Amino acid sequence: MFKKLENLEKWEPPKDWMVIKTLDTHTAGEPLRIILSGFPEIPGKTILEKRRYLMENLDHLRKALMWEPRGHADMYGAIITEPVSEEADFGVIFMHNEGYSTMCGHATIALGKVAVECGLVEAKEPITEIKMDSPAGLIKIYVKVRDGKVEKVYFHNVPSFVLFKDETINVPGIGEVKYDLAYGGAFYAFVNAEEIGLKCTPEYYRQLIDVGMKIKRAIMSEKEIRHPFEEDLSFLYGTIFIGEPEDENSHSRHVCIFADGEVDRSPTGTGVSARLAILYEKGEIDIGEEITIESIIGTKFTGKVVEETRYGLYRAIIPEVGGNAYIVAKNTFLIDPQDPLKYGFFLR
Amino acid sequence: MFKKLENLEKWEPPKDWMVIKTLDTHTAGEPLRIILSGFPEIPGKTILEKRRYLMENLDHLRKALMWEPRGHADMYGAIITEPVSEEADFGVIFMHNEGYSTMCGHATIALGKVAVECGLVEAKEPITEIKMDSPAGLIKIYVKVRDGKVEKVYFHNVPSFVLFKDETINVPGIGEVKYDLAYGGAFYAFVNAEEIGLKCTPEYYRQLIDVGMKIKRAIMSEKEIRHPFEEDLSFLYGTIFIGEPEDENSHSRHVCIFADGEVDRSPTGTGVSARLAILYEKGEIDIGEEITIESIIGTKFTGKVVEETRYGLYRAIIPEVGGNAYIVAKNTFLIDPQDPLKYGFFLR
């Protein structure tokens, strides 16, 4: 019987079943579902064109993988494509509970870890470089390797800058909220949790979603959020609550509310990128000064300003974010043609 | 490159990595993670003894599979064991966000579907019978089979009975709540959603968790919930909100809040079982009268009173619950010995 049961592991579905193979990771608790097979080729000369193809043709499959029952409200995914730039190893479109997504730091860390750990690139010591065409632009991944093992994954992000500083907005049913709006490969409104009467802790999970989504919708309806070069990137990704650090060597804590009330269990890599831009512009950190930022579950990333730059009319930085990721599953997702919930459903 | 990527499918972890192989289903949207391998043998002469062995020795693995990152707050699992009774095919202990669990109807339907679909038992027409030792006692599974295909999965539950009728309890911050308390292989307090100012709809997800868990904790602190024969079964499993039916042929809608604020996406099989006992005792349904009950996502089970019986000092019924399940994945879960979140974490 126990053999029959184990042998179910070699059960093969009918030939009219859709099969999608994935490698799942967590980065600081935040999942990445890496699609290995079962998607068609994604035409487009740019990553943003590829992202448009996916949004217009393959959003059913995004739901099938990100939504219950195969996923959940807080699941996050990656489609790997051929590079579109001269120097990049691969291209990527991310996905979440609401759609196909722009750049994401926790996912970049996971992709760097698996590239070296699983032997897709040679494990060079002390540093392996991988280049990735993201929807936001070119990302440089630096994997720290010792004795053929990954010690840490860093990336250097696209230019990160402050859009708005020390704004106030009237949030219906909440009141006056003070925010900075910064770009770290995505746009975020940063607010102080304690000033709003919240903590960046599990016991405030529901209130962080509710208040974060109201702040997000209020800023989206009142402010133009313009990427200097790309209409498709010109939108608010989320609200990030800044909280006091739990641990002595931590700078601060992040809770990112993004997509459709999705919550990042990581400190958010694009979030740390945008935060470094704010702290740098305010003269609160210097070039080469490493800080540590926590998540709602006390997981951590490092952040550091690498250098100064310009991006359109903005003063900008190249930020470094550091972390690590672990493989948690190899999944074969199956879609029964008779399944009435084949493309999943959404509760949160 | 795309071959390298696909070949990640056949990446094999180091020998010191834990590997747990599963078959994932949904029943009316509610997941079941069926463990195929990776657990030791579970000693015990009774299912409740086996449940105690798992709770005392293997709760780390329950978290590893039910909790993020490999699971989520609403994930549900099954451990298959050798039968302990003369006539049963197998034994089972269920698991959820809080621990190793007693009997569960959505999971029973999934196990019946898989047993026939995946050829663990002969597909007999029109009915295949499978017997299952649950922690609540012997369960009879009746799979309707036509042309070698499963049309529907029914089970006949353990004797189901009313414990308390038309009680009221003061719930702090909510007020006076009217409830019935019934057993359907688990104990539930039934409350009317609309009378409390809620709807059994996705829009009320958060409020259903909050109010359901306050009702649950209040009833657990105030009322003796005694299974006539087994101390380990003597506790309140959850709160079930009764709502008006969305669809013409539906009787009513269920939302079950159970374990640690977990929400059943199905109508709850033990819930329908306990509800049939209430409606029968109130003279609202007769033997052989089939009703349909909806879930928060509008998925459905059938319920029917099969016959009358006694259980200890109670008037009881044998309830029939009907539904269907679909395979959604074959999973190989991996635990990296260096993963600091190897046994997962809990947010809701």
Ligand SMILES: O=C(O)[C@H]1NCC[C@@H]1O
């Ligand atoms: O780390 C990040 O940047 C992403 N994590 C999930 C949401 C963010 O895009």
Ligand SMILES: O=C(O)[C@H]1NCC[C@@H]1O
């Ligand atoms: O259908 C059932 O009985 C189970 N579904 C999840 C919670 C219940 O135990």
